Design a protein around this ligand. Sequence first.
Ligand SMILES: *[C@@H]1O[C@H](CO)[C@@H](O[C@@H]2O[C@H](CO)[C@@H](O[C@@H]3O[C@H](CO[C@H]4O[C@H](CO[C@H]5O[C@H](CO)[C@@H](O)[C@H](O)[C@@H]5O[C@H]5O[C@H](CO)[C@@H](O)[C@H](O)[C@@H]5O)[C@@H](O)[C@H](O[C@H]5O[C@H](CO)[C@@H](O)[C@H](O)[C@@H]5O[C@H]5O[C@H](CO)[C@@H](O)[C@H](O)[C@@H]5O)[C@@H]4O)[C@@H](O)[C@H](O[C@H]4O[C@H](CO)[C@@H](O)[C@H](O)[C@@H]4O[C@H]4O[C@H](CO)[C@@H](O)[C@H](O)[C@@H]4O)[C@@H]3O)[C@H](O)[C@H]2NC(C)=O)[C@H](O)[C@H]1NC(C)=O
Ligand SMILES: *[C@@H]1O[C@H](CO)[C@@H](O[C@@H]2O[C@H](CO)[C@@H](O[C@@H]3O[C@H](CO[C@H]4O[C@H](CO[C@H]5O[C@H](CO)[C@@H](O)[C@H](O)[C@@H]5O[C@H]5O[C@H](CO)[C@@H](O)[C@H](O)[C@@H]5O)[C@@H](O)[C@H](O[C@H]5O[C@H](CO)[C@@H](O)[C@H](O)[C@@H]5O[C@H]5O[C@H](CO)[C@@H](O)[C@H](O)[C@@H]5O)[C@@H]4O)[C@@H](O)[C@H](O[C@H]4O[C@H](CO)[C@@H](O)[C@H](O)[C@@H]4O[C@H]4O[C@H](CO)[C@@H](O)[C@H](O)[C@@H]4O)[C@@H]3O)[C@H](O)[C@H]2NC(C)=O)[C@H](O)[C@H]1NC(C)=O
Ligand SMILES: *[C@@H]1O[C@H](CO)[C@@H](O[C@@H]2O[C@H](CO)[C@@H](O[C@@H]3O[C@H](CO[C@H]4O[C@H](CO)[C@@H](O)[C@H](O)[C@@H]4O)[C@@H](O)[C@H](O[C@H]4O[C@H](CO)[C@@H](O)[C@H](O)[C@@H]4O[C@H]4O[C@H](CO)[C@@H](O)[C@H](O)[C@@H]4O[C@H]4O[C@H](CO)[C@@H](O)[C@H](O)[C@@H]4O)[C@@H]3O)[C@H](O)[C@H]2NC(C)=O)[C@H](O)[C@H]1NC(C)=O
Ligand SMILES: *[C@@H]1O[C@H](CO)[C@@H](O[C@@H]2O[C@H](CO)[C@@H](O[C@@H]3O[C@H](CO[C@H]4O[C@H](CO)[C@@H](O)[C@H](O)[C@@H]4O)[C@@H](O)[C@H](O[C@H]4O[C@H](CO)[C@@H](O)[C@H](O)[C@@H]4O)[C@@H]3O)[C@H](O)[C@H]2NC(C)=O)[C@H](O)[C@H]1NC(C)=O
Lengths: 832, 834
Amino acid sequence: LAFSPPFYPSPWANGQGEWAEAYQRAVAIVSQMTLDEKVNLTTGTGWELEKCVGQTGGVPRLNIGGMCLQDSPLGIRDSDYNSAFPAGVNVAATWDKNLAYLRGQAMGQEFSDKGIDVQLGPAAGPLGRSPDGGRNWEGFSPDPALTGVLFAETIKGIQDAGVVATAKHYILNEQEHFRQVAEAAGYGFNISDTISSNVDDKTIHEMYLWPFADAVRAGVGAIMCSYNQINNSYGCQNSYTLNKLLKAELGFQGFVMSDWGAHHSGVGSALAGLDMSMPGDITFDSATSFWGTNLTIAVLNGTVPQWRVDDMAVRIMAAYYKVGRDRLYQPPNFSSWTRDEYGFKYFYPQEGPYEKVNHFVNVQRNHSEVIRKLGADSTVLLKNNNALPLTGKERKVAILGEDAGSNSYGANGCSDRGCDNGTLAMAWGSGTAEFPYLVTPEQAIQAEVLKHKGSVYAITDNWALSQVETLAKQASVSLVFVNSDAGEGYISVDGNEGDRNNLTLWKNGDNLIKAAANNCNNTIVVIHSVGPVLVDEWYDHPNVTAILWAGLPGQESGNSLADVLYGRVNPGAKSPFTWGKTREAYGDYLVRELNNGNGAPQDDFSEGVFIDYRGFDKRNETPIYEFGHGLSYTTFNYSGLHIQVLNATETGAAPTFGQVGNASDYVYPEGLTRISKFIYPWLNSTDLKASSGDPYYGVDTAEHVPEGATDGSPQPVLPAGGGSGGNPRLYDELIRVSVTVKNTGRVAGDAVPQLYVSLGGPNEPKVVLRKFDRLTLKPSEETVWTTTLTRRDLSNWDVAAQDWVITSYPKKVHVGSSSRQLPLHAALPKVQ
Amino acid sequence: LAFSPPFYPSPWANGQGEWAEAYQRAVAIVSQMTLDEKVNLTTGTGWELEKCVGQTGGVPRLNIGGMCLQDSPLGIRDSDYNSAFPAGVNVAATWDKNLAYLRGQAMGQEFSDKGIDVQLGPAAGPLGRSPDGGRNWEGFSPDPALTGVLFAETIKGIQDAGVVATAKHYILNEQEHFRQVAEAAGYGFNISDTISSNVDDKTIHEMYLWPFADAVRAGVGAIMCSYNQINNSYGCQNSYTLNKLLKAELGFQGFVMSDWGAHHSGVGSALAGLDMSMPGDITFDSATSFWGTNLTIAVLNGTVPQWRVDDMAVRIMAAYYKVGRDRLYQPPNFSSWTRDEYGFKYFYPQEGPYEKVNHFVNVQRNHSEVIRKLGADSTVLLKNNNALPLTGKERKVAILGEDAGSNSYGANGCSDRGCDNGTLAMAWGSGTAEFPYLVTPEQAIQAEVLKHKGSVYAITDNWALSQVETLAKQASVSLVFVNSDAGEGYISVDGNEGDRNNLTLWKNGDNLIKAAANNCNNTIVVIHSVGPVLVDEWYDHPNVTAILWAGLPGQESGNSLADVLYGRVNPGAKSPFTWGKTREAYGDYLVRELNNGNGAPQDDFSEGVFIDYRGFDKRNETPIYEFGHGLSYTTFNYSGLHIQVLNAVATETGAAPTFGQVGNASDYVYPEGLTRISKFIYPWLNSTDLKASSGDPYYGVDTAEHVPEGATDGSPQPVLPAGGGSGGNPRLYDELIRVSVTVKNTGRVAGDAVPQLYVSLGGPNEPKVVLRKFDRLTLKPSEETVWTTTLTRRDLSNWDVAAQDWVITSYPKKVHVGSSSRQLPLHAALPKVQ
Ligand SMILES: *[C@@H]1O[C@H](CO)[C@@H](O[C@@H]2O[C@H](CO)[C@@H](O[C@@H]3O[C@H](CO[C@H]4O[C@H](CO[C@H]5O[C@H](CO)[C@@H](O)[C@H](O)[C@@H]5O[C@H]5O[C@H](CO)[C@@H](O)[C@H](O)[C@@H]5O)[C@@H](O)[C@H](O[C@H]5O[C@H](CO)[C@@H](O)[C@H](O)[C@@H]5O[C@H]5O[C@H](CO)[C@@H](O)[C@H](O)[C@@H]5O)[C@@H]4O)[C@@H](O)[C@H](O[C@H]4O[C@H](CO)[C@@H](O)[C@H](O)[C@@H]4O[C@H]4O[C@H](CO)[C@@H](O)[C@H](O)[C@@H]4O)[C@@H]3O)[C@H](O)[C@H]2NC(C)=O)[C@H](O)[C@H]1NC(C)=O
Ligand SMILES: *[C@@H]1O[C@H](CO)[C@@H](O[C@@H]2O[C@H](CO)[C@@H](O[C@@H]3O[C@H](CO[C@H]4O[C@H](CO[C@H]5O[C@H](CO)[C@@H](O)[C@H](O)[C@@H]5O[C@H]5O[C@H](CO)[C@@H](O)[C@H](O)[C@@H]5O)[C@@H](O)[C@H](O[C@H]5O[C@H](CO)[C@@H](O)[C@H](O)[C@@H]5O[C@H]5O[C@H](CO)[C@@H](O)[C@H](O)[C@@H]5O)[C@@H]4O)[C@@H](O)[C@H](O[C@H]4O[C@H](CO)[C@@H](O)[C@H](O)[C@@H]4O[C@H]4O[C@H](CO)[C@@H](O)[C@H](O)[C@@H]4O)[C@@H]3O)[C@H](O)[C@H]2NC(C)=O)[C@H](O)[C@H]1NC(C)=O
Ligand SMILES: *[C@@H]1O[C@H](CO)[C@@H](O[C@@H]2O[C@H](CO)[C@@H](O[C@@H]3O[C@H](CO[C@H]4O[C@H](CO)[C@@H](O)[C@H](O)[C@@H]4O)[C@@H](O)[C@H](O[C@H]4O[C@H](CO)[C@@H](O)[C@H](O)[C@@H]4O[C@H]4O[C@H](CO)[C@@H](O)[C@H](O)[C@@H]4O[C@H]4O[C@H](CO)[C@@H](O)[C@H](O)[C@@H]4O)[C@@H]3O)[C@H](O)[C@H]2NC(C)=O)[C@H](O)[C@H]1NC(C)=O
Ligand SMILES: *[C@@H]1O[C@H](CO)[C@@H](O[C@@H]2O[C@H](CO)[C@@H](O[C@@H]3O[C@H](CO[C@H]4O[C@H](CO)[C@@H](O)[C@H](O)[C@@H]4O)[C@@H](O)[C@H](O[C@H]4O[C@H](CO)[C@@H](O)[C@H](O)[C@@H]4O)[C@@H]3O)[C@H](O)[C@H]2NC(C)=O)[C@H](O)[C@H]1NC(C)=O
């Protein structure tokens, strides 16, 4: 079985870089705290005990309000009067740094105004190893460079709006199947521990770790560790990923929180690098915690050194101050658990004062604008045989497909979106938000046709093929809507347990397109989906004149699309993944059956870096639509490639901040009514053992504490460490690349120039993406695009050296419009 | 068994009044015609042989194109790029003469521009005897006065636009059950003839006949006779309804066409007063006809007088010239049978030149405006506890009910609208048009909310009550949509065979309302339906703050309603029928079982004139919402009732004329150089052997016995006492009393009032009040106006069966003026007038 080597001690924060001020203020306030106050910062108060999906008790005596942590990566979950933004995968389709940033800012503002302190997103894990992975759509792209830039830009958006962003899920949660023991059981599988992602050290650095390094460098204040094991060590107590990779190598200065139920030990986790336990209990509403009372006891009994809990508290506070949250603070002014105005203050036991729990604050501002735009700018034109834009003079328009119409239960009529009815604007699970409304394609396209006095109908039953065929024969254009859905593992739709059972269109979608195309010579396909689908059966039909993929556009869906169909917006989006001929073309098989008896299933990432396009290119498979592909209403030319060569070893000792006293000091205060199921930092009595209630209390302790876990002495700085996101030499710019881009068509538009390198060597991908931009050119207009390659961009991870190395194989640079359309190349000069 | 007395001969046209010029021209052209030409005018060419739902062959030698007859009373049927207008019951709800006329004009324009010569509408039969009749919605109101005025204005709009209108169905087709033998058989009922409406002479004059008198007087060109029997004589060969009531008493100068399959004899029908056979064959595509060849022969063998056939031709030509159809003629430029551009000329057998059958002519203009406006002006505000209008500042709006959303099969995805899926904007059967589009309440209300940055959702599955309650609890206002559907008897939806099985909301409507009202203190109900529905379970719920009935609005439904909900339009519509507490409160039971063995079911109209509000008033039963009831966003006051008395014809017809000559049988044999299209109905004979050419098993059998006394009598006839003009003796239209009242807008916003003028004619068996006059008046806040109207002699008369005439009885009469049939603050005794 794969094994996860220990790395210890857990590195302490140090005021690195842009963290110096936040750190100093964190240390000044933590220095005034008692042990039980510090422990309060680290432990949620229990599932559904307060307002937010996760919530800490705070430090009342120091005016630090409890920290309110709320989903999702795409808008406020479980609230009201909030916006529903497009999914991360749409942000990726835009290839637009500035849109990523604006969508972050827009969300941040909304979160801030609800009294939320920490947004549980954005997401870059799953990266997207498998096309049928249930949560890939929450993230960005299976490409590390694309994902890392847009992930970093989203984080900066959120955090400049004064909310803490949480980069999740760290790391390797590449599938929903077997991610949780209790979920596995509800689906009929018996496992004793969650699925183990088993991955070699090179693959992890070159692929899955890379966006987290960008997040770290961008200043992210929190990271959420994952439900799965990595080499048979749980993600939320993996000393390797947390202490070595995240804190020592990437130099992360913020706080690591657990996924909800991903906390599996008190002492183990704390020493392996975890800083915050969510939602605070061991299981939901168990009234027990691996931390809280236990963490207090563990410090008092000498097992967890004080400097470790001091550091958790400094990391949590430094992040809070880093985004300016102290200046924006207000208690959460909604409840995640009821929409009632009034309710008991503590929802789960229904205890505490009966008072206002919802204030109905409308935080939407004008966010529908950026939503509508981002939807339009994320609609990839995959095929256009001269069919689009529509002119509005189409005599008769057939809108066809359930995916064009309304959810008969209302836009939010399915809990956490756990269905696929009517238009698909949002996939399912925690990664969701309540719509304020939903503009369907039917509504926006019928409104458009009616503005021009045309005739128009929507058929939204996908087995009404008789009606479809009759209408299609009468129509000047047929717009056919199809989708494919997925989501988080705790919800199953039509037998898809999170992950997609297949990449085929849902609800009769292939048969619907064929029924339309067999009858309109101008049949136009619009796909809403969480990732690629199989188009093989109809994409080259002679009557299929255009095909668009619109992702999961959020609340303005129909207007986003209408904007593109009718030429208000020239699509510039590019596919952020590959569209293969068959499922098999992707390889990268999800683990769907027990392969380790009733122990943890073993998920061997035995293809290495070769996911999505890297794998298609390696096997010489030709995708129907390649990574980076998207058409425009204009054409571009790329020419004139020019290349130009450009010109701490130890940490401090772990500090302690403030004083720890006797057990007496941490016993439950006498005046306090203990709320049922509420998690507190206090002890029943000065008897440590009895106050813990742990059947293993005091037994074999030192043997269960790995070597070095309590070593507070100065430590070696890793060669690839020493900065933020890695050693700062990694970000030295070594080569400047320039090309001329011209708009050679007749429509103002955006180009997405894409720069790939070949690093060389028998185990490297043929091409890997490194730089891109989105450039707005009018007809005939030209621009020079210039970009630089850093030391990191040119390197491969060398496991012997434990560092990035520019290997001696010759390297090449490629510039064009997609991973397969690269008309400019050059050998790069040797650099080092 | 009820018996229908003979009335012969069949009255001939005389150029009566406004018909003079059209008659003269018809006579000049029919004088030039051969017998077989004349026959061609009288007989359709066979089901689906040509373009229109009905079509004659015309007279090619005289450059007269075949007449194209097309449904429906609310927009062109079976075509493309036409409009779909609100149903005739919506016109009734407007109580607006001007809107009836404008809708008529917009329809006639579209029909005209398709090359259609005759619109198969509007409808005033059924009148609305039973609240559950399947076709009431195609007509207007169970009130004769309201219905007749709006019927006439509709006819006038159509005909001023250059298309012949057809007043249908004549007469007493008050239900769908048993209306047709093969229809009843398909539903498991074995009858040898169709349902017989059995009505007394006073009831028929005072109720069912009255709107047809208005039609005749307004100049209607065509009348369509009905499927039912009247006292066991078929609608389309009943010499009493056709010869006596319609042609002699009302003095009708145009032509009588059959309903499709309603023609049941050649000789008997022609002598009883039919003028045209549609679609032309005995049954669809039987390649036999009671007319065509048979009518040619019936003249050649002396059984049908030449003057009778000449009279058919003159009435058809006269209706055609009367609307100026000749100045607008073009062949129909669409096909009812296919939407293909190209096809065989003769659809049913697939024969003839393969050529262009569809031109896709866009006839709609900006008619969506009159449709949007009329939908809005026919939305009746039944209840409003200061809930409406909405301001757009509502934070969260819940749109609740299937009836708010889309038909998932597309707006036209049920053939002849034969389902109740999604929003109800058109009921089912032949009274339908293809929508060009359909704006749902969901679309229009969501667009409105979003215009104000509010929050909004539609839940459109009526059993998703869990989601309904959860949403209703968070809403500022819940808009709940419910419907009740019906249609022509050839289509059954959910076992409703034309007629509704009950008056209860469809698709869980009551439970939906209760699920919402139990949770929003601001629950607002919108009803789309063919007529009244049972409201007792929820109308007085403390949480139901407003209730609207919007009928069947046609293509702009959602925009009509939003205009009303958000106060762009102050609603002024008034209920054109009664909302009772129970089905039983209306009495007036449909005949739903065989009650005469396997013979024709007998439908006795025992209630007499006591239908809808007349019956409620007789029985002292209190409607939930009375006939005439409608709220407004303003208030109106009625005062200063005054009455002023005012100062205010041949006795024989000519002899029956004949125009042109009849020659030998051999003149009428199939022309030799002519290919005979399969199923096509021609006027021609196979040989000079009459008997064999006819193929009639009954040819020359007991012929004299089956020709009723007087039926061939071409000599001058007495003029009936109640006859001698258009829509009755012209003395009936003398204005005898002027009425005036001041109507004032006492509220804060502009709006329309609908003053209503009722009379009590007096007598032990007269309704307590019957409507006579109304108008719709637009008033600014504080504005006053003097509403003035007049009562005619007809208005004050009762039908006296012994005189056979209208008579003002000696019982004291009163006038009552107010805002509904139960809200009548002003009363005045009338002085003796005669
Ligand atoms: C001060 O107060 C403190 C607060 O109250 C007191 O704190 C308590 O101290 C106790 C010990 O005194 C703790 O109890 C013991 O904990 C250990 C660790 O359990 C967790 O971690 C397991 C992974 O372990 C590795 O990794 C973590 C870091 O992630 C390290 O810290 C460990 O050192 C260890 O590291 C090695 O491996 C990694 C690579 O993986 C390397 O990198 C290193 O180099 C090392 O090689 C993990 O597997 C555990 O998971 C179990 O528990 C989960 C939580 O419920 C559950 O979801 C999992 O499914 C799994 O369940 C199974 O196991 C548990 C028992 O642990 C059963 O109840 C359950 O039914 C399942 O069977 C967990 O997350 C733990 O391993 C110890 O248990 C072993 O040893 C005892 C005997 O001492 C046996 O009875 C057990 O059966 C068990 O045996 C297994 O392991 C042995 C090898 O160690 C092997 O010999 C056996 O054959 C067998 O396989 C104890 O449970 C306690 O957690 C802690 N409480 C709190 C609140 O923090 C403190 O005592 C007091 N101080 C003083 C001075 O008084
Ligand atoms: C020149 O060319 C012409 C064209 O080719 C030739 O025209 C043909 O002439 C024949 C006569 O020679 C015609 O055949 C006879 O027709 C009659 C009438 O049938 C129709 O009307 C019936 C209702 O009739 C009344 O009302 C009409 C007007 O509405 C009058 O015109 C009638 O005079 C009669 O009037 C009385 O009643 C009304 C009140 O209703 C009063 O107001 C009047 O004062 C009078 O009292 C109607 O019921 C018929 O309906 C049947 O047929 C329909 C299909 O067409 C069908 O939908 C119905 O369900 C119904 O079917 C039942 O009956 C038919 C036969 O008619 C059966 O086949 C069928 O299967 C069912 O049983 C129709 O609409 C008709 O009455 C005659 O038949 C009666 O008499 C014959 C014997 O003479 C019997 O064999 C029959 O069984 C039948 O018996 C009934 O009536 C008797 C009363 O007299 C009674 O004694 C019996 O007991 C019984 O109940 C003949 O069929 C033929 O229609 C016509 N063809 C064309 C194309 O026009 C012409 O001959 C030729 N000239 C010369 C000189 O050569
Ligand atoms: C870790 O996190 C958790 C979660 O955030 C922290 O737990 C919270 O800690 C709070 C203390 O900081 C504690 O707050 C208490 O709430 C009680 C309930 O308040 C509500 O109900 C009342 C009653 O009708 C309303 O007045 C009020 O607005 C609330 O709606 C309060 O009762 C407590 O107030 C008392 O203490 C505060 C100072 O904190 C005084 O200002 C206040 O006047 C009250 O003081 C009396 O009680 C204290 C007992 O400590 C006495 O010292 C003082 O002399 C007063 O005594 C008189 O009155 C009492 C009874 O009223 C009488 O018996 C006595 O004889 C005197 O006459 C206080 O505000 C939260 O409840 C608690 N949350 C939960 C879920 O448990 C935790 O502290 C964190 N841990 C660390 C180390 O930071
Ligand atoms: C009662 O109503 C019916 C139906 O309206 C009438 O029947 C129609 O009568 C017309 C006019 O008489 C018939 O028209 C004839 O059509 C022939 C075929 O037309 C098409 O096919 C050719 C093939 O290439 C095309 O060129 C042509 O444009 C059409 O597309 C024509 O060939 C005829 O013109 C010539 O025909 C005769 C040949 O015998 C010659 O003597 C002449 O040279 C002449 O130019 C003619 O136009 C039509 O077919 C009938 N319809 C049906 C369904 O049968 C009755 O006439 C009417 N009865 C009365 C008494 O009015």
